[PDB]
Design a protein around this ligand. Structure first.
Ligand code: NAG
Ligand code: NAG
Lengths: 49, 473, 49, 49
């Protein structure tokens, strides 16, 4: 069972002008079904039972 | 002794409506500057020679630190009861002689140690330290506190019960090391009026006094309501005998009725009132007329309906106490009130308060659990934190999964807080351009934080900024 | 019966010399001290220490 | 009781059995006056004689 839970994340240097809009595009993509669609095509094709 | 009006006191002298029993109190008003023991001994023992009296009531308006002890010695050497009413005669004492039937008007030493803990529960001051000096009675102050702490479901923390043994010369070095070991928000002190100012001088040098640190002292430390030596730090809180509603003429009238209804009531049952020799001598020869029978029921008396019974040590069983607080203007101000194991504090929330922030929460079944306050003690229990609630506020207890995060975070980032449940909406929503709920208060600068079961999304992130998630949803 | 007794504990004239002997050098070192005040004058003159 | 009779024969003493008065096992309770703590039950009779 999982014993260290910490997700991924786009890394940026401190004092970066893009540090806000990058973190607001990810939140919107979760709620639009976009990141539940990339999972369908790249990570979740069953091959063996 | 002191500055007073004779006619004002004498107006209520013959005012006791004691027509039920023929006491006939021949009250005599005596005024004399008798601070020194010589004047007392040459007057008390001469009164019986002139006027046949078997009862003396003493009052004073001086801050003498040993007048009660020297006045008690006359009671031990005689069989005439005497009561201390006002001034230094009402100061506390450790013990009395078995033959010294002298009593006072004032709270005992155990009760004062039981009122300090009765105001810390309301304001949730669960960590404290004790500083005590040598005095006849300082042993009971520590013991009474420990007994109450042991048997209680509330979370009491004790530390630095070190005492100041300031008796040797050049004690500044010794006091500084002892005083530097105090690291508690509130410190309880037990000293004398003169001894207090010595310790307070060292306190300001260290820097302990100020905001974040509070001191509580008993009645005798304050002493006077108008003589402020300007050494007491602002915010000092003390519990003292009521004096605004307990006037000097009223004290005399109340005291006189106690003695009159005691000796006369003995004639009702014993039917033989002793007549001791009215002189300073021949006390041993008059040992036949023992006053043990009189002493049996002189303490247990009643006047118009009340309990004025004294303890065996000579302390009033049901006294009246008030809580006073010093201000910037160096004038004592009334804050609290005590009457028959009841407390009525004027201030619902202590005015004194970046390190102090507000917190808004909300009840959710596995995360934030709200339970009612303990009925037995009227204060929140252990492992839970107090949390207010509107509708006049009501104090609940809050505990759960999210609260443990808040307590653990505040330990490392070292900041304080005070939660309170929201009452307008829940969880946040936007209606016609207005936010209501846990988010509708952060946006209006009434919270500055909000811990609970909030959900991150784009609509809310453009108004407030969230932290790193600690759970998935 | 086994008891105990104190020698020179009941001779009052014995301790008179010892009482003033100890205070003899106590006053000597007290003389060379600053601000040597005096006790209250009489039973009525002063009520302080 | 069957074990007690074995010790009496081995160590050569005599006994007499009496039950506890109140009937408890033993714990430390505080006296109402002050904080004097005394045991009660079967554990408090051993120390009392
Ligand atoms: C992010 O978006 C705001 C408004 O859409 C815009 O003003 C800002 O320039 C954007 N950030 C960057 C780095 O362009
Ligand atoms: C055991 O007890 C008996 C009873 O008095 C006595 O003879 C002696 O103490 C013991 N007998 C032995 C050791 O043979």
């Amino acid at each position: 069972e999982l014993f260290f839970r910490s997700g991924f994340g786009i890394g940026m240097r401190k004092d970066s002008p893009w540090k806000q809009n990058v973190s607001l595009s990810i939140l919107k993509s979760h709620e639009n079904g976009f990141m539940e669609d990339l999972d369908k095509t790249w990570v979740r094709y069953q091959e063996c039972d | 002794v002191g500055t007073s009006d004779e006619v004002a006191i004498k107006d209520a002298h013959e005012k006791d409506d004691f027509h039920h029993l023929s006491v006939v109190p021949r009250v005599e008003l005596v005024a004399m500057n008798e601070t020194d023991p010589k004047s007392i001994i040459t007057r008390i023992c001469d009164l019986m020679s002139d006027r046949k009296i078997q009862g003396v009531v003493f009052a004073d308006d001086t801050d003498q630190e040993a007048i009660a002890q020297i006045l008690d010695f006359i009671s031990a050497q005689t069989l005439t009861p005497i009561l201390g009413i006002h001034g230094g005669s009402s100061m506390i004492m450790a013990d009395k002689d078995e033959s010294s039937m002298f009593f006072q008007f004032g709270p005992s030493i155990e009760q004062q140690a039981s009122v300090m803990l009765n105001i810390m529960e309301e304001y949730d001051w669960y960590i404290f330290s004790i500083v005590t000096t040598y005095f006849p009675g300082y042993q009971d102050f520590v013991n009474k506190i420990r007994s109450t702490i042991e048997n209680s479901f509330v979370g009491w923390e004790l530390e630095e019960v070190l005492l100041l043994d300031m008796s040797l010369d050049d004690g500044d070095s010794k006091i500084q090391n002892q005083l530097k070991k105090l690291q508690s928000p509130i410190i309880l002190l037990y000293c004398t009026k003169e001894e207090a100012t010595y310790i307070f001088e060292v306190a300001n040098s260290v820097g302990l006094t100020g905001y974040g640190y509070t001191w509580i002292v008993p009645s005798l430390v304050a002493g006077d309501t108008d003589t402020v030596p300007a050494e007491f730090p602002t915010g000092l809180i003390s519990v003292s005998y009521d004096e605004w509603d307990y006037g000097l003429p009223a004290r005399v009238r109340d005291g006189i009725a106690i003695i009159t209804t005691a000796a006369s009531d003995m004639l009702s049952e014993h039917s033989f009132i002793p007549e001791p020799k009215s002189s300073c001598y021949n006390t041993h020869e008059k040992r036949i007329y023992q006053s043990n029978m009189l002493n049996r029921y002189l303490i247990n008396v009643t006047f118009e309906g009340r309990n004025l019974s004294f303890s065996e040590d000579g302390y009033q069983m049901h006294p009246k106490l008030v809580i006073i607080l010093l201000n910037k203007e160096r004038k004592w101000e009334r804050v609290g009130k005590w009457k028959d194991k009841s407390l009525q504090m004027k201030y619902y929330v202590w005015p004194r308060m970046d390190d102090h922030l507000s917190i808004v929460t909300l009840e959710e079944a596995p995360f934030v659990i709200v339970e009612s306050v303990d009925p037995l003690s009227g204060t929140c229990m252990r492992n839970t934190v107090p949390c207010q609630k509107r509708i006049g506020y009501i104090k609940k207890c809050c505990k759960g999964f999210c609260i443990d995060i808040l307590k653990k975070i505040s330990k490392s980032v070292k900041f304080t807080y005070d939660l309170y449940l929201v009452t307008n909406g829940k969880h946040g929503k936007k209606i016609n351009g207005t936010w209501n709920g846990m988010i509708g208060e952060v946006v209006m600068k009434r919270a500055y934080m909000a811990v609970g079961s909030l959900t991150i999304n784009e609509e809310r992130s453009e108004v407030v900024d969230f932290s790193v998630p600690f759970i998935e949803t | 019966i086994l008891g105990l007794q104190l020698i020179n504990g009941k001779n009052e004239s014995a301790h008179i010399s010892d009482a003033v002997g100890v205070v003899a050098q106590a006053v000597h070192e007290l003389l060379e001290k600053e601000n040597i005040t005096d006790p209250p004058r009489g039973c009525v003159g002063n009520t302080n220490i | 009781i069957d074990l007690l009779i074995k010790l009496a024969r081995t160590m050569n003493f005599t006994y007499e059995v009496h039950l506890v008065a109140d009937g408890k096992f033993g714990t430390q309770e505080r006296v109402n006056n002050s904080n004097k703590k005394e045991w009660n039950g079967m554990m408090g009779e051993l120390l009392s004689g």
